[PDB]
Every structure is written in structure tokens, then in C-alpha cells.
Ligand binder design. Structure first.
Ligand SMILES: *[C@@H]1O[C@H](CO)[C@@H](O)[C@H](O)[C@H]1NC(C)=O
Lengths: 72, 373, 373, 72, 373, 72
């Protein structure tokens, strides 16, 4: 039915038939973009804690952008 | 064993080419203007090839029109904390992509969800220059697609981050394939030495391809689904179909089957798709066992084979092997071992990559050398 | 050098078998009923084998009795944000498991903390059908257990997601082991050619096992703790015990030690457990140095050895080698190099996988060929 | 002691004795389960921000389960 | 193909040594007292070696002076939820480090951002006892630094977690390097057999180093950024400079070029830095194509070469090859294939690791044997 | 100048010159520390949701510390 197998004692070897192919014949490239923002050194009063959290996230974002620039 | 015969090639040459064309003065503004309207567009590159382009994340829009307006308007203190989490979302992706590119030197071998989501990957597959059958195959096995594709970080400038996702192309589909397993075939004479061993070296995968046979020697670099065999044509040789004759008869004149000769009397076990081959030589204990009945067969010296029906374990010396318990029908083709056809005094005691005709010619040469006296 | 002699086998055949047994009508309902009471239970599968079963995460209870009552009560208006975070907890594990299975096509080679936590893994080990020594060994080295075990995604149906974690068994424990390091042993004549080189090919690990010796040629596929050697019996050959004689005397008639012959006069360094072997040939600079005192030894041409006590660095040409600073006692067995026992004119200039008897016999062949004229 | 090493200059080879064995020799399978819920598609007003976050988390959960079903 | 000639060495011996020196009574308190003032300090270890020490994360400070004081003061109910998220930050790093060490058995290959951030890595590089040239090189290629360095989890006690980051030392810089690509060179007669094949085996990287040539056979262990080749001196042989002569003339008396002989008539393609080598034998289809104009060349039987200028694709049978689109100038040195200098009946049909002089000597032997009649 | 390449049809082999070296001649070790806290692991009312979340986070932290201790 689906998968079969034959063992040749003559040459001490087995063959496994019944499989189907999916072969990588080539490639397909595709450009993927991410639109970024140029934060120009913000400045506001850090009295709230939520503003501190947003500033930490902005620092993470700017550090990510700088790290990506530095791998060139 | 035939992994050295294949040629070497650059895997990401296409992605690197698309990157080198994106570094030209301009070409980034082209993509930016094309994506000014929607999130997906076909762009004609300066090298002529037209490529599909996705805008998978819009951060300039969110930062500059939804977060910074509310922040740097007045009263920088925000009244709701859901904005903090909403910004932790839609930013984790950029951070994770940056970290993946940093640790992997800019090119990742499996394409992660951060690089490309399943919805985006399916949208990319459906808009590819391939037949609908290939589209269905790729869409059903997106995980294997991610395993066989790369993502090259390309450029970051002009307020745009770019990386090229280089996807596999499954041009050949649904052609019949078969795997060939081999094991050493030695003599069983009682002497401690003078014991000749012969093996077939053409082990690996074979698939029909354009009237020829694509052969993959390193079967470890081939993934297997239910009965679908995903391989890379680059890790492959291209052979005539007559190589298949090596299975019906190894002495046929049409094709010459590559073999290997040695004198190493080592007992081994090779587990096949549905069953196990046991080459039991020397004084080694070779056993076939069922889970609930213990040992059910003791192998005599020579090359033998057992089916996966009723046999659940194959032991050779101290090594234990679990046999694949997948359904199928097995066949035992009775025949005399080829190793009993040669003289131990004329046999080549060591030859790694030889063939049947080569061994026969060396035998003729050595016999002519001996007969001269 | 003997890595090619090993047989091939299916590694996850047992987990895949348990998976194929989990698709039978009623087996998942059996496991669910077994885990209806507690979070761990031994279940006799329809395959006969009894397996331990864990319920590592209960989301149906939380979602259906803690989230859905509060969400869809009147108009799904939520009053507190701690519910969002409480749901990000208890859900990260499922998402990470999904991602791990997606990137690895359903089978992961190291078992992560997401698959199985250290508490759950220790609880699973302690309730296994193994001796208390094996329990202690597995419990002390959970990292090596995770490195040598798999996780096969099995089935998802009947409101249950199941994956089989296929753990090692460690049947052989506490038997003595020894590693064998080899280096090329050449002659030291000043001529550019006519310089014969001999090497031992049996390098790797050796352990006593059921009156035989399990030999591991690919010593890289063996992890080492303080003095415990975790190896896989599948990456191994099985040899007679007499092979150890190759250390006390290499010309003994009982066992034939596999060697390698070449004519390549290349300087090399092989770092062992407690010291370093230096094969210094040609005009190469070979140096032994201490971290705080600089160079402390200059090597003469030949094969020499230094202990790790006082020596922290070995330099060969431009290559630098840091020696293992592990505690132990080293011994230098003085003796004449074997390579000085052969004729350079009769020596076999090339044989990759040979032995003492094979090389010595081929010398007889060539000498008989020369003497006939 | 606990570890010794001998260097044979005869054959230019070293032996490192004193180690102990831990050989695999076999396998032990174990089924590990995760109880899931097939929550039925909600229908409510997505006016709140926290409810939108909960909806996103439910989408993540359902998509993970769907990938797992689609991974066979 | 020459990977077996290399010597073996311990890669993490230095980091493990620093760890074993870190287990001494009073060394963790030494490091902690040194880092009590600042976040980085040079510490003279008990073994004499002075190491730089970093405090990359302070949790005791935060836990004991910012979280527990407000938690367990009075009315343990907390008034702000931003503390929960602020604690989810600064704690993800510890969890991820723990998980990375758990899955990688305590020593992780390329050093991730969780182990060591880019700011911390640059700060560590800039404060090292190396010349400014190495500092600039390491700072510009932090990704290759991460790929070529380890992180060994060392000890956790006295409220401190310690791991040794073992960074590369690029002592040799800016010396000229060259890659050598090889392909089988066979005869093109129409006969089914009697077709001899010759190949060069010295393929891989070569760099000038202290008047010698550091040769890397496993070119896979060498990264390339722009035209800089980052290699590891441990995965290398050290050869005389005269080996380069093998390119201007392969029969020169100074150096003996290693070759390989076979009788396998296999068509192959080897993609080089700027172009592609095509060994087209048999009835195989060999094609060179441009992306915008299709097939532009059909290869005749033999070993040929095309430049990457105008050629974007090389097809051999069913294998497709994308050529590297890196800019440069290619040169075609016309000459007669060496394989046409040997007798097909006297040629050694099989020799894995041989050289020109060895093959010539075996030919001399066989010819002297033949001439006696 | 820049990268060049020569193809010898004589020996069927290509050489790619013009590259520069950066060879790993050695190693540099560096100890990197993370200061941990021995927080007293109990005694608060698990009535609040924020307090329960902080207690779960403390459990995560101490379990991480315990896992690190088990890496010996
Ligand atoms: C080699 O030399 C002589 C043959 O006359 C014999 O004594 C010895 O056993 C021979 N060894 C072999 C053939 O291995």
C-alpha cells in the first residue's frame, strides 16, 4: 500500500519505496521593511512612574536602533 | 559516505545579491514610495528583478502620531497604564529581531516568528511565482519552510529597517522517492584475520527528477513528513536512472555500483524505514527482542534482516536500537552474499571509494602480476 | 578516526512509537481519566509499556472557572488590569512550547525548561522504574539529562495537548572508563622527504560493559562531569576487553591495534586530560609556558609530553593551546618510539584505516616483491 | 588520586584512567499533557483597552493551539 | 578535506581554569569587595592572572532597597502596579541567563545579549590589555566577537552569580589571506570507463603569519565580514610559505602539493568568491544563466570557469547554484589539464590522501616493474 | 586595490586573494557578576492581586536561583 521495503540479502542492503518528493529547486527573495522613528532626544518631567516606564521603553528602542546601525 | 563528492555552493547568494542592490544611492526611497500607500507592493529593483515587499510593522506612525503627541503635548504624566503595555507590544518584535541579528551575525538559519509571522508567511507564499500545488504544499508545512529558509539583515537607513527573507522553492513535487540503506557484508570464516568486508556506498535518498535521479548521500540533511521527503537539490548528485538496477542486480553491465572494501570485522546494525539490518561478525551478541516477550531471535554470523512486525528492539553487543514501528510490508529477497565470490588473497585489503568494475580490474591486474612468475 | 564504523539508527523510534499508540481510540481519554485525580500517574498503555504521565499545566480549570465567569458576565467590561497580567502568566509557557515545536518541526533535541521544569523533571525521575543509584545520578545531573533527551509532540485532541518526553535510562553506571589520546609519531631525520609517520587511530573513550569494552570514537559526543562520563551507547562500537592490551604492549598477538600511516611531517599538539602531547617536527617552534613565568620549556623534534602542573600553555608554530588545569597525577612511560622499527623504503606510505598486523603484513608483501628481482 | 594519566612515548599516546561511567543503554518515554480549553468565539464590545488586551491574548492562545493542530 | 591532520585542544580550558580558581575560599568575597565601589574593576586572581570584572546587574540593591521596604512595611497591599512591571524588567535577564545555561549545559556558544550587552561588551573590549588596532577591530565586529567567544557559568554563592566570558584575542591582524577552491579534473573521453579523475585537496583558507602560512582546511570555521577573514588558529595547520607555489606551478620541487585520485565521473559545481567552477562530465546539462536574459552559456565537457559578471545562475543536472554577486576582477589562466599527463592504464585509480611526489613514485614503481619484461 | 580571483584551468582550481586576516591567537577571560538577594521568602497576605503577582514574581526569582544552584 503506502510504504513498502525490500531487503536484498545478496548485497546486504534495504530499499524503502513509497515516498514522495518535495525538493528545493531554487530560492525566492523578499524584502521586508520596518518603518522607524527618529526620536530627537525627548525631554519631559519625570515625576510620574508611568512616564519613567515609557522613557525606559524609548531607551530600549533607541538602543535597538543603534545596535542595528552598529552591525555595519 | 558519499558526502564529499557533491559540490559546494553559497546558500544565501540570492539574498546577499538583493542586499547589495539595496545599498545603491536611492533604491530605499523607491521601496518607501511604493509602500507609502499599502503594506505590500511589488517593486522593480534596479537590477531588473521585481520583488515583493512587505511593511510588517509601522513604528514611525505609532510613535509619532499616537505616543509622542500625547506625551510631549503638555502634562507629560499619562492617565492610563494600558499605553505602557500597548507599547510593550508592537516593540517586542523589533527588539527580538535586533537581538536575533546580533547573536546570529545578521543571518538566522531558522526564520522565526519575530522575523516573519505565519499570516505574513502564508500571504508571501500565496503571492509567489509557483503552481497552486506548490502553494498548498508550502502552506501545509510552514514549519519545514521556516527550517529551509534564511533571513538576511540588509540595511538600516532613511528611517527604514530592511531585511531580505530568502524562502525555498519546491519546484519538484510528488515524484517517487526511495531510501537505500547499506551495511558491511563480510565473510564468516573462523580465522581471526583474513576476513574480507564489502559494503555498498550509495546509501541515501533517491528521487525521480527530469528523467534523471537526484541522489542525496547525506540523508541526515533531509526531513521526512508522513511520506514526503524534503531535500535540498544542492546537497545532491544527479545520476542516470539505470542506477536503480544496482538494486535488482549489482553485477549488471549498464550501471557500475560504487562499493567499499575493508578488512574490519566489526558487528553493526542499520535500522531501515520499517525494520533492521544486522551485520553480526566476530564474537558479538546480536539479538532481536519484543517489548513483552524479551529476546525472540539470536542472529547467526553474517548479514541478516528483521521486520518491524513483532520485533521491537535490536541489540548488538551493548548497543540497543529501537526499530521504527511504522506500518508497511517487508520483503526478503533471498540470495547469496556477494562477499563469497572473491578470493581472500586477491581481494583489495583497503579501498574506500571503489566500484564493482574497478575491483574486477584490480583483480585482473594483480592476477596478471602474480602469473608472470 | 574510527567514527565511520558506527551503525545508523533511529533515535526517536520509541517516542514515535508511543505517539502512534496515543492515536488509538480511547488512549487519551485513558490518560485524562488517570490524571483526573492527581497531576502524576502511571498508565499501562495499549502497547503493554507502562509510562509515567504528568499534567504540567492546567488552563481549562483557570480559563473556564476563573476568567470566563468574570469576562462574559454582563458586557465583558473589565474593571482591573491585574487580570491581564495574571493571564499573561500561566499562558507564556504554552506559547513558548508552541514556538519551540514550530521552529523544530515538532521534535526538540534539548529538553528546555518550558517543556519540563526542573521540579517536574526531578519528580518524574524519582518515580521511575530504576534503581536508587540511577535516581541519584539523574537527579544530580539534570542538565546532562536534558541534553541527552528528546520531546516529541504527540497529539492534540479531546481538549488535551500531549507530548512525549523521551528520557535516557542510564543502564550502565559506575564502571571504570578511560580516554585514549593519540598524536602523530614520525621520524626526526633532517631530510625534507623520506620521513615516515605513524599514528594511532583508536583515540576516544573506553568503558567496561558486560565483560566487553564500549568504545566511543567520536569523543566529542560525550559529556564529562567532575569525573563522570556521560556517553551514548548508540555512538559506540563494542570490542573485546583485550583491546586494553594495546596500552601495555602494542605488538601483542592477542589484539591487533588499528593504526594509520602517512608521510606528512606536520607539527601538532594534542591536549589530554592532565597535560599535553607535542609532535614537533620540521623547523617548527614548540613551547611550554607558565602563566606567571613565561616560556619554561622548548621542545626538541619528536613526540614529547608535558604535565599540566607548572605548564599552562603549549605553543606550536602560531597555534596556542591552553591546558586543562584539572587535578590529577601524570606519569611518563619512557620507551623507544615504534616508528624507529620500520624500513623507510618498505614502509606503506599511505593507509588510512589499517592495523599492526595489516601494515606489518603489507611490509612482507612489498619486501617479497623487491627481493624477487 | 581520583584521576591518573599515563603517557606512552613508545606509541606517542596517553591514557586517562579514573573516570566513572554513565551509559545511556536505553530510553524511557513519558507522556506529558497540557489541559486546553476550546473557548467558543466571544461576541462583546471591544470598547475598553484592557478588554482589547485580553482579546489580543485570546488571539495569541487560539493561534498557538491552531498551529499545533496544523502541525500534523 | 585535510581536517584530520589538525591537532585537538580544549577550547574552554582557560575559562574553566578561571572558574576552578574562582572556587577558592575567599575569592568571591574578593571580587564582591572589588565591585563594591564601581561596576568594573581589575582583580588579581589567586593564580596571579589579573582579570577584568564587571557587575552587569544589581538585584540585591533593588530588592533590598526599592521593593521589599515598600512591600512589607505596613498594610502589605501595594498602591501602585507599575512596581510589578518595573520588577518584571531587571528580572527577565536573570531568568533568561538561567534558562540559557540550563539548555546549554552551563557553557553557551555565541554569547547572547542576555549574557553580555553591546554597551557592556564594548566597555570590556575598550579596557583590555591590547593594542588600539585590536580594540578598533573588536569594536567594529562585535557580532563576530560574540560568535567566537564563550560564556561559562562559574559559581553562584554569597548572593552573587558569576560567569566567565571568554573573549577571543585577535593577535594577528591585517596580513594577506587567500581562499583556495578545488574541483575534480577528469578526462573527457567518450568511453564508459577508463576515465581518470584528479583533484586538489588543499582547499580552504590561507593567511600569512610570522613568515609561515596558517592554513584552515575547514573553511566553515572562518567568518568573512567585508574582506576580513576571522579564523581560529586552533582549527589550523602551520605550513611553510612555499605551499603558495602550488598555485603558480603544481610540479615545483620545493613544496609537494597534496592531491586526490579517483575514477568517479561525477559532474560538479564549486562556487568561488567571484565566479564558479564547473566540472561537466557525462551526458549532464551544464548551464550558465543571467537573471534577466536566461541561459547564456552551455558548458562543454571538462573543467571550465565563469565569472560572476553577467552570470547569475549555474545549473548542473538538476542542481541550481546562485553565484555570489561580490564585486572584483577575475582572471583566467589558460593551461592544459594535468590529467592529460598520465596513462589511464597505469594511473592509480584510488588514493584518498596523496601528493604529486607520492603518485609519481608509485608510477615510477609500476613502470619499473613493467619495463623488466 | 580590492578582492581579486584567479582560475587555473591547469589544475582546475581557483584562488581568491585580497582578503585580510583577523586570527584568534589566544583568549581573554573576564569574570562577570550579578549580585543576588537572599530575600526572606514569605509572610504577606495573598488577598491582593498586585501582591499575589509580586509573590509569583518572587517565586520565579527564587526558582531561578535554585535552578542556578542545581548547576553544580
Ligand atoms: C613476515 O615475515 C616472515 C615471512 O617469511 C614470517 O616469519 C612472518 O610471520 C611474516 N609476517 C606476516 C606475513 O604477517
Amino acid at each position: 500500500q503506502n510504504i513498502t521495503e525490500e531487503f536484498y540479502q545478496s548485497t546486504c542492503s534495504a530499499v524503502s519505496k513509497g515516498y514522495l518528493s518535495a525538493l528545493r529547486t531554487g530560492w525566492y527573495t523578499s524584502v521586508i521593511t520596518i518603518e522607524l522613528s527618529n526620536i530627537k532626544e525627548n525631554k519631559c518631567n519625570g515625576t510620574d512612574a508611568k512616564v519613567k516606564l515609557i522613557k525606559q521603553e524609548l531607551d530600549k528602542y533607541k538602543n535597538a536602533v543603534t545596535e542595528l546601525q552598529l552591525l555595519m | 559516505f558519499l558526502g564529499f563528492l557533491l559540490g559546494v555552493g553559497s546558500a544565501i547568494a540570492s539574498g546577499v545579491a538583493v542586499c547589495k542592490v539595496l545599498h545603491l544611492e536611492g533604491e530605499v526611497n523607491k521601496i518607501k514610495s511604493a509602500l507609502l500607500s499599502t503594506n505590500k507592493a511589488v517593486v522593480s529593483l534596479s537590477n531588473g528583478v521585481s520583488v515583493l515587499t512587505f511593511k510588517v510593522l509601522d513604528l514611525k506612525n505609532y510613535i509619532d502620531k499616537q505616543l509622542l503627541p500625547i506625551l510631549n503635548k503638555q502634562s507629560c504624566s499619562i492617565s492610563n497604564i494600558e499605553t505602557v503595555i500597548e507599547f510593550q507590544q508592537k516593540n517586542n518584535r523589533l527588539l527580538e529581531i535586533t537581538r536575533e541579528f546580533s547573536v546570529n551575525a545578521g543571518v538566522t538559519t531558522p526564520v522565526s516568528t519575530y522575523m516573519l509571522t505565519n499570516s505574513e508567511l502564508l500571504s508571501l507564499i500565496n503571492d509567489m511565482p509557483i503552481t497552486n500545488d506548490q502553494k498548498k504544499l508550502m502552506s501545509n508545512n510552514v514549519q519545514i519552510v521556516r527550517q529551509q529558509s534564511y533571513s538576511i539583515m540588509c540595511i538600516i537607513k532613511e528611517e527604514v529597517l530592511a531585511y531580505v527573507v530568502q524562502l525555498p522553492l519546491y519546484g519538484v513535487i510528488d515524484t517517487p522517492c526511495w531510501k537505500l540503506h547499506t551495511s558491511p557484508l563480510c565473510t564468516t570464516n573462523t580465522k581471526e584475520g583474513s576476513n574480507i568486508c564489502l559494503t555498498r556506498t550509495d546509501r541515501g535518498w533517491y528521487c525521480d527528477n527530469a528523467g534523471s535521479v537526484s541522489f542525496f548521500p547525506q540523508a541526515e540533511t533531509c526531513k521526512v513528513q508522513s511520506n514526503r521527503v524534503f531535500c535540498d537539490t544542492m546537497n545532491s548528485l544527479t545520476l542516470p536512472s539505470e542506477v536503480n538496477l544496482c538494486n535488482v542486480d549489482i553485477f549488471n553491465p549498464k550501471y557500475d555500483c560504487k562499493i567499499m572494501t575493508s578488512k574490519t570485522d566489526v558487528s553493526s546494525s542499520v535500522i531501515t524505514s520499517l525494520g533492521a539490518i544486522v551485520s553480526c561478525y566476530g564474537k558479538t551478541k546480536c539479538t532481536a527482542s519484543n517489548k513483552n516477550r524479551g529476546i525472540i531471535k539470536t542472529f547467526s554470523n553474517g548479514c541478516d534482516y528483521v521486520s518491524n512486525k513483532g520485533v521491537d528492539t535490536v541489540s548488538v553487543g551493548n548497543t540497543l536500537y529501537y526499530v521504527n514501528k511504522q506500518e508497511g510490508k517487508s520483503l526478503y529477497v533471498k540470495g547469496e552474499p556477494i562477499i563469497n565470490f572473491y578470493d581472500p588473497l586477491v581481494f583489495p585489503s583497503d579501498e574506500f571509494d571503489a566500484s564493482i568494475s574497478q575491483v574486477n580490474e584490480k583483480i585482473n591486474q594483480s592476477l596478471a602480476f602474480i602469473r608472470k612468475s
